[PDB]
Amino acid sequence: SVDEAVTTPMLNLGSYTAMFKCKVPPFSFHAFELGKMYSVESGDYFMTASTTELCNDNNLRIHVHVDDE
Amino acid sequence: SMAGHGVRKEINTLTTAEVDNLKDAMRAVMADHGPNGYQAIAAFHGNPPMCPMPDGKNYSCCTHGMATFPHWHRLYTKQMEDALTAHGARVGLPYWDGTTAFTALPTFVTDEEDNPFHHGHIDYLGVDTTRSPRDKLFNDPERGSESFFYRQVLLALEQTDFCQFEVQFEITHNAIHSWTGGLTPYGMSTLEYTTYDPLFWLHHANTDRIWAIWQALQEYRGLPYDHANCEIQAMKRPLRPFSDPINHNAFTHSNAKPTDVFEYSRFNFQYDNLRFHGMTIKKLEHELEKQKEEDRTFAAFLLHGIKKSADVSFDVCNHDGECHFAGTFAILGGEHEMPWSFDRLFRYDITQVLKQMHLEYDSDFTFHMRIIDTSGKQLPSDLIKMPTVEHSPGGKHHEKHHEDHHEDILVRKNIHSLSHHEAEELRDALYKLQNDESHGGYEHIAGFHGYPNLCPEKGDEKYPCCVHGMSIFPHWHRLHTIQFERALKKHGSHLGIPYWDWTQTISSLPTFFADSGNNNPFFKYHIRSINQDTVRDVNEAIFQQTKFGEFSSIFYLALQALEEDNYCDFEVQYEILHNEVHALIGGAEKYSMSTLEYSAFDPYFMIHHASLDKIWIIWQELQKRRVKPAHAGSCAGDIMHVPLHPFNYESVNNDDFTRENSLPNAVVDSHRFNYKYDNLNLHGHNIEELEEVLRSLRLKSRVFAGFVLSGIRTTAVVKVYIKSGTDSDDEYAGSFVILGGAKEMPWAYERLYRFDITETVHNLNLTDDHVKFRFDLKKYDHTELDASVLPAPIIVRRPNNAVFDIIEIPIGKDVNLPPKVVVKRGTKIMFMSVDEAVTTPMLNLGSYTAMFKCKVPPFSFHAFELGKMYSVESGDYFMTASTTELCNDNNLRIHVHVDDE
Amino acid sequence: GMTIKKLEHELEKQKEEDRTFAAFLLHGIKKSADVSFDVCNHDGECHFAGTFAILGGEHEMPWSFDRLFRYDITQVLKQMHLEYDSDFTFHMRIIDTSGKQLPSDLIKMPTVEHSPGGKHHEKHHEDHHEDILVRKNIHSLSHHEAEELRDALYKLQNDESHGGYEHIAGFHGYPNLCPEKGDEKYPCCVHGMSIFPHWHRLHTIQFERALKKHGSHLGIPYWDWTQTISSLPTFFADSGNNNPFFKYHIRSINQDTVRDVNEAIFQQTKFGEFSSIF
Ligand code: CUO
Ligand code: CUO
Ligand code: CUO
């Protein structure tokens, strides 16, 4: 949550790589990633900025991916 | 990768790659210690014994000598199959068609070295499996087809009744175990050991196949395939250990009950073909009936558990003492087997033997029976009761048959075939619904799709539940349509929602709507929530140039949908085709059918989606004929594994089917929803007939204009205009519509939108790869909007004969689009050298997404993409600008991706 | 009484209907006994399924039936209102002649079987004929039902006679009639009086009776306005198609019946403490 200026939203698994380009939906908080939280499930994930503009402020695109050993 | 089911095909048609995967997968399966291991699965069959009885006694789990027998084994085969798949097999156990004569055991099993199929180790025994085939195994044909396996199975097939069928079927099943295993202690001949041999699966796969063929025949007969009137009680009880929560496999666990077991499709595996021997199902039925014509004499046996496996042979003897070999049957068993006794007799066709004896039914002759154990020791005759002799005549008069149907089966009959009497139920049902404000009400049902937006759980954000543009787009709709229909039936409906085949030449709008007077409920509906009635601004949407191929207007698009292979590529064609109708009906109007947020309310809307749904069905199975089944998870499945909102959210129609079976994988099959269409035909063409028309398009090379459409957040139209060499004269290349609106959830077509420009381009005479680009103009329901986001058309040429290649020509410079996935492994790719200023380099697969950001190496031409070129290989690709700076000139990032159907 | 030909016909008729049977496997139980069994639903409610007897004794030769003995359960299930698919239990008691009970071990559990055949149900049935009239709910209204109301009202509205709509409405509002040639006029409408509902109740029937004479199937539809009001009834709202329910032309003075609807909505809570009308 570093930098209070940006809150906790951080979209989540926006979709696929194309979406990852920073497409985020109009305020539709497709919840998944919140404040201090955690997540057990596997598969392919992703994290994008809370808002479309908020994305461009630092390019919050990190595409987390979670596979097997 | 095939999207659909793990298919099981014949063993004799072994494809090297397939065999390799199976061997490897099996090897891994054998190795794993886990509960979904080879040893663990094998254990289910018998030793070590997995079943508890309430006394604590342990017995072999397999159900034999019972009606449940095919059900239990069906699950067992699947259990092993799932394991192999996890291991990486292309899904499916191969089936060994034992029925047909074969010189030797399948090579697949036979190969001694590096073959996991050859044998398996038995941990408890501490020895490997063994097999000693009996020579009797290759049955001697009189006819050539006339073999014992064939005959035994054939008799089973003839039986109408499930129970009658099962006994014959099961006994036949046993024959393979005996002959293969023979005397050896470790093999198939023993109940305990059999699961260990890998051949076991091949055999059971075949046995399951036999059952499947029978079901198909029953369906053909019109007799119930899924359920059995007999042994009602047995079906209900679960088959352990599958029912146990210990069971790692969810699917088998879910279909623990024999009632559940019947539907194989739920199992998610299919067979390459039902055809028994060469015969088709239709043919087989005919063949069977012929047998009926002649009288036959049978010997009947009552069999019970004789604590062991044994082979019985009996001969028919005349008083003279002359005898001939009557026949053989086998019993599979062992110690710790569960007790079983057949409810009915096992029938064996004596007729040939009697004729040879020249005996008559009435004549007094004797049956001699000898029971031999596997060891060769003779058993006492006390084990089996003396056989009965019966005569079966041939012919019939006034045979009233009893085949049940219509538990909850509705049918959506054509609006045209509609009758005055039929029409009333529709009007009444709809009206009663419309007046209904409850959660079940019409006002509420329409609400799911358009405004007001519900689905997020008290988000207070709102959210259009309407899923458009997603891969799921038809899935959500198909369920919604049924939701509308189901609501009506509860309201008092006789028939299903009428569907309209708008593809055919449209003389005028349906009378169903047009009759605005008499307060027709189908014509419009009062929102009541906000107010305002459902109005529509009809468009011409007519003028007929030509039918039966090259049909101008809607049909081509729809026909174009069926044309497309793969689901993912299909869905786009599916939606866009659907998108068109909404526009003509809704027109410009605020509250119209064209307005996504509102269109749900319109009466036509509820029915209209049904008409589209019909197209999906024809296509769904149509693909199956193609040996490319694609329904369920195919390419972009991830979206599917999540329930359709708001159907799952607690506040739906509360329809038990809907609320529960909201899952997309479930919705894929319409037959579950309890409704059927009066016909499969489109534009007056039957499935086989229509398939021909499709062939016509493949006949001629056509150039297509690729489109990467992304959520505009509004519904609108686009006019594609092709530039001309002369001045710049545009041309009406055509037009398509993009549905959407205000705060809709974001969407973007992963797949390209095939749009046919061909004739238009030829006039101007330009080349697909060569400098060819066009500027379209798009427009909102009424007014102009930013044409800007094209995004730049990605020309694709679809070669004529020898298709399913598809060529994809992206572009070079001033290109605009995210990662486009042509998919359809085997597709071809290229690039447009448009703008001489930029040469041919275009990096290639730079690396991963991070690299895609435009990292390109210093002049290191990591070759891959050149000038006019192509590429067959699959996997994930990419294309970036030749140089780092050259990237920024137009953002040449297109991340091509190429997966499987 | 039946002849052979007749009997065969009688038997076939039985075949026509589906039946459910319980099957018993019987073997020598070294004695004579009477067996009675009941069908019970899960509830534990039971009904007497049926009875059969076994004749036997010591030194009887051993015997076992090759097939099951069938007993027709169908009537019992219907009484239970059980379905074949439904899960129910069969309870069996074996009593010897002496009255001593035998162990159930002697007989194996019964099997159940289904016999044909089914059909599709057409909605052939007819409910009540117009005996007495009934004022059915406006909501429960059907399209077909709706027409009779519109037709009946319309025919009345066009009717100027004393029986006419213009006249019936006249009783309550203007013009005022009731005093016998008082030339005073007088609103017949009785409001505020103790009789207030009495006069109205009769007037309402007067309206309804006028319609039936005019050609009505059903009674005047009533609207339960207390319940949360989503919107005005469709019956009125459909101003188009010249809906007779929406408005009426006075014709006497002129001017159509217009209404200035008020919000009359917003729902706070139902089922007690209902705000507004209820
Ligand atoms: O059935 Cu248990 O063995 Cu093939
Ligand atoms: O799909 Cu939601 O509209 Cu036809
Ligand atoms: O008006 Cu006279 O009563 Cu309601």
Side-chain angles (χ1 to χ4, degrees), chain C residues 169-182:
Chain C
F171 285 78
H172 175 276
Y174 261 75
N176 298 150
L177 304 170
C178 20
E180 296 292 79
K181 209 305 281 177

Side-chain angles (χ1 to χ4, degrees), chain C residues 242-254:
Chain C
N242 293 187
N243 183 221
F245 274 74
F246 179 61
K247 296 169 171 188
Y248 168 69
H249 194 297
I250 302 308
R251 184 182 309 120
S252 58
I253 190 66
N254 197 48

